[model samples]
Target: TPPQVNSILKANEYSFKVPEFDGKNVSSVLGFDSNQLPANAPIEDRRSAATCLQTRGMLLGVFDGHAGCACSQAVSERLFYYIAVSLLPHETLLEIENAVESGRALLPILQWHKHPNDYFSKEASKLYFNSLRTYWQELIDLNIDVKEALINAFKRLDNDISLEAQVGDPNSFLNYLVLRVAFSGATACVAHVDGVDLHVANTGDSRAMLGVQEEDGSWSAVTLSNDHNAQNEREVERLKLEHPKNEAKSVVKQDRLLGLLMPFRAFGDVKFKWSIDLQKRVIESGPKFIPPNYYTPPYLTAEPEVTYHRLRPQDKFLVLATDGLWETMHRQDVVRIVGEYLTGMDQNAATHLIRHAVGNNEFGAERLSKMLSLPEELARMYRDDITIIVVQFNSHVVGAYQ
Candidate 1:
């Protein structure tokens, strides 16, 4: 194998092992492996993981961006905090607001298991604080449950994204930045795990699949979240039902939402959600683009479909990845490869999955070399950005909870 493959494959690979006391596993998560392979000029896929100080769970997610990376970038940076605020008890919210009022607060709400290459928008931190604080403040005046917390977080973040763009920042640069975030869109698939409880909140097409080891030792795949896209029959029906009968024929065309977007539901893309008058305001305001034949206002959403499962000892891990991954490979193969790599690791699970996805045969080396060697011009035409996170649960801790 060429050494260049290692450089490309390992560049964005990051791993985190959960902390334990006295050699006993302290959490249900043993560790996680994550990686990114860009098929775009700038990769639009983003991933995050962290331990919650205000709640009893680990948060992990993968996001896919469209039009541009702004929405995904914003969501990656802020969604976990939204999740945190939603789960905090009334007392915790008050503590945070009081600290804010006194100008004395070091937010210990989440202890991020950091990676060297993670991104945060320095220009927008103050906006993040005020927007998040507003949500927290109101919460003081909430999920003190996994299900409700995930749902509320997803809903509130979408609302905030829409609102902030409508009320542009006074600062010129930040105002443009906020509009970029609003005009573009992203898909989010997040998982929250506490002891035996697992909740997956998914918007758009990215997926969260569980790896279950059967009694006979065969690997099984359980899809915890559904893709809200044209491929999903129910989702197609949903769009048709959401609007009047007059729009059914035009709602979905050639397996795309309004014949323009791929993922049926997503965050931002005010292009798809706002009314014609509001859409023209943003576009006419300049520095904007709107879809063609854009009728029947409010065609997209950020409301996630939340799924819950109680982790059993047999459920070993979860694979959360963008549609690019699920497109190139099937869920069964993904689980099998990760399950094999969970024990047979010369490279981390994420790297291994990426390796196989590039090509899976004796000629794979040459195929992989060619795949990685593509110039940026032809890359997107052939492949899409792939981001994956594999979280291996601790057998001991999972059983103890069970």
Candidate 2:
């Protein structure tokens, strides 16, 4: 039976101030459901959800939209609501994992298949073909990088569609289909910092920053989250190791099928990197059949990186922001702006800060407004998406989570 939930599910509620179109500080709490796809949206597009569990003090959230704003908006509305309600009931990684498995089990059935490599083989796959198998076994024979090993595991799957189709029962294809998506999902960064500890998980480019107020009353910004993008050196290096294209013009090439960089690791669209049907895989940075120069087990290295930090006495609050916000501002720049705002703390101030801080501030909402009046581009880059959430703490509030 296909899973179905009523459209009347609860939405998110939160307390924060956005500079009113006119500008005003309106505090509110958000509540909503995140599992449903937004109306009038394509299933292949990317979306995300984020929320704060009900606890002492406040919770901040930002949903960065991609593909289209619908998923972002939907996530913005529902993610928090679900978190707010889930608080106290069960709030741990284990709990979240359980919820995901249970929810997926209830999803509506559709045409399904394992990632393509599951069917064919090195001889069948487009790139390495027979060489793939040889290269794969060589890696296992030699000691390689752990990530490379993961790549080999993903690569070993046969790309033989006929074999996959014939190997499985009529219904077996259905389960394999579910397994494929089990990987490429979405880009969502979630952080729950109570009085004692700070927990964070991310799937995409969104970020988190921590600001600490000093004894003298000044504040400093400490990076709390990392972005998942092709531009990152680590990600580029990760893929280079997995898929070593010897004769390739450049170390990297566009999927041609997908316009984005080749090394996108977070959740979103998988088809772009793999075959349209997960069962028929495409050459993404998946596990390799043979090991690269520095081979290792557990190759393909696609696991989402995770980390944790303990709360401190001087910690002021955290800023949860989307790329739209981080693109234009540095982590420290964000802390400085937010530090001043928190001191001035209100919707009016936040609005003023956001409007004054958008892309290339040089162009005065005007053309000939004044070339000289515009400030020189300090950094060599301009950016998009600038949302923020500030979480503050005082000495008295220390150990509040305890």
Candidate 3:
């Protein structure tokens, strides 16, 4: 069992498929992940997909972690649960509670489909459960709107992550785990598709793009989320506005918030977002002390930009990926490659994108073999952990909504 678990943990590639709809045998959903890290290094990229049992929809997401993998792994496993619970109807919520009280098997909120390496932190379940239950109670009492529900879920989870680290535990293991999560940071991009209505919520730089087929059978890109980095002038302006007029020069330097973080917004990185005094106090209390610059307080925010799209017949599929994929290929190029690949027998567009990313040296199979054969240490030098999810829409089902 240990060896099996290790195999699962060490495996570098994975794929998942959702069953076809509208009398088709082919799956409408496909995705995969690849690790360029060494044997001892933890994979910092995470992905997840689930069908919402309480509603008509599918949810997909990718999280890219910086500093370490703990936060990413935890967020990957727990974020969807929060989103699904937020979307649950009041009747379903009551049913779940009744089942729990009666010692009955609880009704499913989300049917999680994940790769073996997409592991959850076994030690953190209870902590996550208590917080989730608290939020669900609020949901039941207030009956918040669905969009509002998603927004709150993102903000609440980030807040919980920050709070947990501040309130250290007696148990050394938990103290370390919580500290690592808070000290480090991650970027999350998620998509919720309900019939023709698609909602994308994003923080940091991970992206979601819609691939549309034109009348001439050409492909085009519809960017669903703005990359919240320095390149986004609006994001930089928003950050400057949040701070004092005198702090503008100090707020952003070298195209990054505080010149230390790449994304203007993100989860965790409390050292950057927290008050300088709070940062000093938290670091002093750390199980393993590590400190960050504190010239300006609250340079980062966890608030995500939520975008809504009404899918059409011409709208084909959606791609949700971390920065690893975007850094290598242009958005237009990614859309074209996937669009053309989907036309043939092969359907794994994520794999195709990855192949191009890693194997496009000299543009030949021989070069690709050499590229793939690189040692882990060498590979890590060349590539970042890449995670991708391609969600194909049934044109018939999407158009029917119109």
Candidate 4:
């Protein structure tokens, strides 16, 4: 009873872009989840592509894969249909909730029940072919060697520029790998309009923005999705009570008096909450949630939230971005750039916007002097990666009625 998923679809990077915008052609771009780095830059590299050409609509998603990006990729490739075509048509957030829940449950099941030797079995056939149809495309996207890379990445601390460290040390490599083997995965944020309503779903820090074009021709902000930083009210309470501390220095950044790793809820990486080791794990090997840090197990470990808001005539565009993008650019800056690009009736605008948003001017070595200036004592605190995505909607797509 782990979780059920399609083998074919589970095998590849999960990402796609939909094409269509204004009266011109449109495109979408997806890249590797930058969050999986500090170890393997390649696994962090995601497969990005444009999905359609006829209609000027694009689907933008940013998934932060934790233990492995397989699940993140799975959602990226299939969740678009689930959100737009299937769930939105019903106009029920309940259906959307079910999709995310079922997806969460499905992954572990497939990993638990699927055996390497059973690929062609009739029973496996039904489960793989019919039952898990949503993931079939993902299965086809897999590369065996890349899967091994994922395992290795989880097991070691890879210094991108050098081979100075061993791949199986307890404090560095083995710990994370052990953690990955226990329960590590990904988080996703998807945004697009399905000819019904504008839908935005997220499970991590990645954000989605809705903006409007003003009468004076400037883009005005409407709404933005917040990151699941652990500093949020409930999260602070949960972490403090879960991992009571006698010392204050252990927490580097905190809200008021409470200390938490992030300020919001996240999809995975919760094992850090229960283990002082933060690297130790039991994986999917058993039904154990004893959690090394807590005296009693908690009801929930890690789960993401799904929220939906109706699109309006004033809502002119959507921006889907990874934490990496934000690590360098401000949210409002992103809106202005994307809105300017889209306003020109440009088809290749999305690609230009992404490239424009990336690079040295944003996260360049010189600009990172702040981190460099940190004393060695303080510099060891944190590391980060940045990425982003943008989707624009027009009155024509939502219909010219309003």
Return the top candidate by lDDT. Answer: 1
Better of 2 and 3 by TM-score: 3
Q: Assess the local accuracy of residue 93 in candidate 4 as a C-alpha lDDT between 0 and 100.
A: 30
Error (Å) of candidate 1 at residue 198 is 0.7
Off by over 4 Å in 1: 286-295, 361-365
Per-residue error for 76 in candidate 4, Å, reads 3.5
Q: Whole-model lDDT, candidate 2?
A: 0.39
Evaluate model 4: give its TM-score.
Answer: 0.52
lDDT per model vs. reference = 0.86, 0.39, 0.75, 0.40
- Pairs that collide in candidate 3 are none
Candidate 3 least-lDDT 10 residues: 31-40
lDDT of 3 by residue, 151-247 (tens): 8778888888888888877888988898889888889998987767789999989999999989999999999999999899899889888878887
Q: Write candidate 2's Cα lDDT for 1-402 as tens digits.
A: 011111111111123322223343222211111111122222222222232333431333444444444334323333333333333222333343444457543211111111121122222133222233333234334421222322222223222222332233244433343233233333455564444556554435677777788888888887765666656667556555654464232333453112343325433233333333332453231322221222222222223444466776666666666665566556776677767766774233333334445423542212212221233352113334344445555444454433
In the range 1-402, model 1's lDDT, one tens digit per residue, is 579888888999999988788977878888999998999888888998888997778899999999889999999989999998888888788778888889787558888765688788999999988999999887876324768878888889888988898888779989999988988899999999888888999999999999999988889999999999887999999999988888898889988888898999899988888887887776666444556556677888888999999999999999999988898887888898888778663368888888887766631425788888888888888778999999999877889875
Put down candidate 4 lDDT per residue, 192-252, tens digits, no spaces. 4445344455555677776677777777765556576643555445545654464222322
Candidate 2 ranges beyond 4 A from true positions: 1-61, 69-186, 244-259, 276-303, 345-350, 359-383, 399-402
RMSD in angstroms, all models?
Answer: 1.8, 14.9, 4.3, 14.3
Worst lDDT 10-window in candidate 4: 157-166
Clashes of each: 0, 67, 0, 42
- In model 3, the number of clashes is 0
